[PDB]
Amino acid sequence: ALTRLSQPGLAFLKCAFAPPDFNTDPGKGIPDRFEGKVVSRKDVLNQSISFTAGQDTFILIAPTPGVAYWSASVPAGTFPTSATTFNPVNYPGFTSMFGTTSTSRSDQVSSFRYASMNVGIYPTSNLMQFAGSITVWKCPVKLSTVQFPVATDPATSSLVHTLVGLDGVLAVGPDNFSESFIKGVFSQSACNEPDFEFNDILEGIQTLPPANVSLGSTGQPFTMDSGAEATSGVVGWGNMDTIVIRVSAPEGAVNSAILKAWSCIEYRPNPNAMLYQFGHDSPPLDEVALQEYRTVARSLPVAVIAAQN
């Protein structure tokens, strides 16, 4: 039964669906037609987060390389508005991979493609003071461009980047998971394209919308910020569904948890980088594994409790 799948297929399924059920080595690579030289970058995070009482906290697990999540706080019972700004939390080792300047992100790598993306919240507070719930739903955010004229001398037309599909954060999706806070959560994402394609590396992006461009002329609902160029930034956007998590806490409730994230990512290294020493060949094609990937992705719930990860 399980002997009809090669070892790379099983490893790929394990990294794609169940990271935290194994000790080491989640997988090897994506078993598709491509058999070039790639570097598999496995990311993991361990962050302790405390939720303010009387505020609603939104966490987005976006497919941005090198960044774990973006967070913002809104008063309870409301949703992000035009004045809300999301700030990023980085994986360990950002500047060692994407430099320390806005125009030096493509020094070590040139392209990437996601293979897995998981999250998990484990409660830490006691059983006598917690209060609230956790809600999870998925939104298909993409990256596109918007054009508009500018009244200079002579007048020209501008074409800047923009994010389409961000309106899903302003309401709860019909396919959503909800339960009490003391039970945790565990969720995963899947590829939203018929095949796995490589995405390039973008340069110079530090804020969406960028500077000298006013929000409102781009149609975006809210703003995404990354701060100083020496600490964090935006380098790309993969082909995965963004995960939206909302934690609500009434007044007089003390809430705390430990957040963990995972990522199976494939990179195309550069000859002059140190990462080239650890490259290897991508696994060959396996049709059975590719079929079971879609079947299992379709036959799974949106999220489960932390006790069933």
């Binding site: 039964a1 669906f17 059920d21 079971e292 079947t295 299992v296 489960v304």
Partner: peptide, 17 residues
């Protein structure tokens, strides 16, 4: 059961059917 048990059961059912 755990999650890997669920995945294994799904795979077995799919292959059987």
């Amino acid at each position: 059961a755990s999650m890997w048990e669920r995945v294994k059961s799904i795979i077995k059912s799919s292959l059987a059917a």
